[PDB]
Amino acid sequence: FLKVKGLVKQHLDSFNYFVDTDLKKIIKANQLILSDVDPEFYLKYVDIRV
Amino acid sequence: LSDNAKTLHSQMMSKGIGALFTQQELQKQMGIGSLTDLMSIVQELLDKNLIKLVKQNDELKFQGVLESEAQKKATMSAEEALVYSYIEASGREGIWSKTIKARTNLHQHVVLKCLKSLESQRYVKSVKSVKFPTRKIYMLYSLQPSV
Amino acid sequence: MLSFCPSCNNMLLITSGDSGVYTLACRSCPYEFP
Amino acid sequence: IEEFPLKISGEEESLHVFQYANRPRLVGRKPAEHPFISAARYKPKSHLWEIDIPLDEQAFYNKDKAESEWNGVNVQTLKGVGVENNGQYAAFVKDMQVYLVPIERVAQLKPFFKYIDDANVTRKQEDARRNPNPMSVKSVNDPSQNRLTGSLLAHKVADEEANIELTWAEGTFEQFKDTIVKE
Amino acid sequence: KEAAAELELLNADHQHILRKLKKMNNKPERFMVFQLPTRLPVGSIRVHKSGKLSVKIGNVVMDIGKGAETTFLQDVIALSIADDASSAELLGRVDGKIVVTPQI
Ligand SMILES: [Zn+2]
């Protein structure tokens, strides 16, 4: 049980859940910043990687 | 189609601009068609942006305006003529520039860039009012300094 | 006090009736009883 | 040992089930009757079922309290919101046959007090006309502003929509053999 | 202990519903509603050894569990609608309600 699942189980397995999956769920919740002046300008984020 | 719209606005311009018209006398006046297609040419006349919809309190009211100011406002774009409607709605006591921004949601740059062109079109002047000094007050050239 | 009023289930209320009689009747439902 | 085969024969028909939150089943072990529907009321896109019931007369009525306050008489109406779920098949049996059909919505009928709602809408209207104390050009969608949506928008579309006046009937044999002839 | 008080009542629940499906054979415009499990991975109500009930609505998929369980003091009435028209028909009221449970 401790060979494949060590002693720092809670610290690393949350940060490894952060960098892979949890960042895509944040750019998809703050995408498409817009400017009301000159309304045909848009910056949207397609993905994110570390 | 067009000729039915040509009859109704001649009735709108028939009377002197006061005595603001409504539907309850309009169907008495122009009731050759049913209400289903009467509205459809008036909404098309709203698409021809001549008729406006004025308000006497708590109820539905209409008002026709002249063709002379309709042509000059058709030269403007969407947002250009939109802000020109607010000043002409005020008319007599002017309107404050910051309150115009509140009724549009257009922020400070796009409203000031619009009226910079609009003064060169000679439709709007700036007066100095005294019940609140040092505020931007706009009117037409029709000159009501009642304050 | 288990004062269920039929067809509304709301309540009952002791009403000061005509000549001060103690009839029972709820509001918000046309129901009465001596 | 034995077997009772069943088949499902139901399409195209969205049959509904009402639930009387007032009326019990049995009165001393004997079940009572279901009351006589005077008329119905339905609105699409919000799926309300406004069922009207009429009352008994002067013996248990107290009319001089009813006439003098609201003037809306002999009508108890009740509202039920139709809700959707999966499964919930309705079945009738034949001799050694049993046939099923899916139920599309289920409503739960609560007593919608029509007139006391209607009693105060006149009371506010007269209050305005005692002391009445006294203009629309387009606006722009802004990306730093919110607009009303969600659950209260459903109440904005459940207030003004087309009623349908139902003719309440009692059939029950036309649909019965319609399932029998279909395999 | 208290696990045995469950099975004897479900044993008695077979007989209370086998009587009810027998009295209801006279089709007097009577109805009952019951819920079938969706999400399939038609059949036949059967009687097993000494009165046990099961259905096999799949080609192989067996559903042992059935039980008449809900207590309700309400008058429920099945009625049809059609296309927002003159289609209000009261068919009948509902006597009981059973369930269907796939065994695991
Ligand atoms: Zn009551």
Swiss-Prot record, chain A:
Q: Where in the cell is it found?
A: Nucleus
Specify the domain of life of the species encoding this protein.
Answer: Eukaryota
Q: Which family does it belong to?
A: Belongs to the RNA polymerase beta chain family.
Quote the record's miscellaneous comment. Answer: Present with 1950 molecules/cell in log phase SD medium.
Q: What is said about its interaction partners and assembly?
A: Component of the RNA polymerase III (Pol III) complex consisting of 17 subunits.
Q: What does this protein do?
A: DNA-dependent RNA polymerase catalyzes the transcription of DNA into RNA using the four ribonucleoside triphosphates as substrates. Second largest core component of RNA polymerase III which synthesizes small RNAs, such as 5S rRNA and tRNAs. Proposed to contribute to the polymerase catalytic activity and forms the polymerase active center together with the largest subunit. Pol III is composed of mobile elements and RPC2 is part of the core element with the central large cleft and probably a clamp element that moves to open and close the cleft.
What name does this protein carry?
Answer: DNA-directed RNA polymerase III subunit RPC2
Q: Which gene name does the record give?
A: RET1
Q: Give the residues of the full protein shown.
A: 51 to 100 of 1149
Curated annotation (Swiss-Prot), chain B:
Q: What does this protein do?
A: DNA-dependent RNA polymerase catalyzes the transcription of DNA into RNA using the four ribonucleoside triphosphates as substrates. Specific peripheric component of RNA polymerase III which synthesizes small RNAs, such as 5S rRNA and tRNAs. Involved in recruitment of Pol III to the preinitiation complex. Involved in the configuration of an initiation-competent form of RNA polymerase.
State where the protein is found.
Nucleus
Q: Which residues of the full protein are shown?
A: 11 to 157 of 317
Concerning its family, UniProt says: Belongs to the eukaryotic RPC34/RPC39 RNA polymerase subunit family.
Whichever gene encodes this chain, its name is RPC34
Protein name per the record: DNA-directed RNA polymerase III subunit RPC6
Q: How does it assemble?
A: Component of the RNA polymerase III (Pol III) complex consisting of 17 subunits. Interacts with BRF1/TDS4.
- Naturally occurring in which organism (per UniProt): Saccharomyces cerevisiae (strain ATCC 204508 / S288c) (Baker's yeast)
From Swiss-Prot, chain C:
The record places its C4-type zinc fingers at 5-29
Q: This protein's superkingdom?
A: Eukaryota
Subcellular location(s): the record lists: Nucleus, Nucleolus
Give start-end ranges for the coiled-coil region(s): none
Q: Where does Zn(2+) 1 bind?
A: C5, C8, C26, C29
To which protein family does this belong? Belongs to the archaeal RpoM/eukaryotic RPA12/RPB9/RPC11 RNA polymerase family.
The annotated subunit structure for this chain is: Component of the RNA polymerase III (Pol III) complex consisting of 17 subunits.
Q: What does this protein do?
A: DNA-dependent RNA polymerase catalyzes the transcription of DNA into RNA using the four ribonucleoside triphosphates as substrates. Component of RNA polymerase III which synthesizes small RNAs, such as 5S rRNA and tRNAs. Involved in Pol III transcription reinitiation and RNA cleavage during transcription termination.
Name this polypeptide is given = DNA-directed RNA polymerase III subunit RPC10
Taxonomic lineage from the root = Eukaryota, Fungi, Dikarya, Ascomycota, Saccharomycotina
Name of the coding gene: RPC11
UniProtKB/Swiss-Prot annotation, chain D:
What are the record keywords, sorted? DNA-directed RNA polymerase, Nucleus, Phosphoprotein, Transcription
Source species, domain of life? Eukaryota
Q: What is its main location?
A: nucleus
Q: Does the keyword Isomerase apply?
A: no
Q: Which residues form a coiled coil?
A: none
Its localization reads: Nucleus
The task this protein performs is described as: DNA-dependent RNA polymerase catalyzes the transcription of DNA into RNA using the four ribonucleoside triphosphates as substrates. Specific peripheric component of RNA polymerase III which synthesizes small RNAs, such as 5S rRNA and tRNAs. The RPC53/RPC4-RPC37/RPC5 subcomplex is required for terminator recognition and reinitiation.
Q: How does it assemble?
A: Component of the RNA polymerase III (Pol III) complex consisting of 17 subunits. Interacts with RPC53/RPC4. RPC53/RPC4, RPC37/RPC5 and RPC11/RPC10 probably form a Pol III subcomplex.
Additional information: Present with 1590 molecules/cell in log phase SD medium.
Its protein name is DNA-directed RNA polymerase III subunit RPC5
Complete-protein stretch covered? 71 to 262 of 282
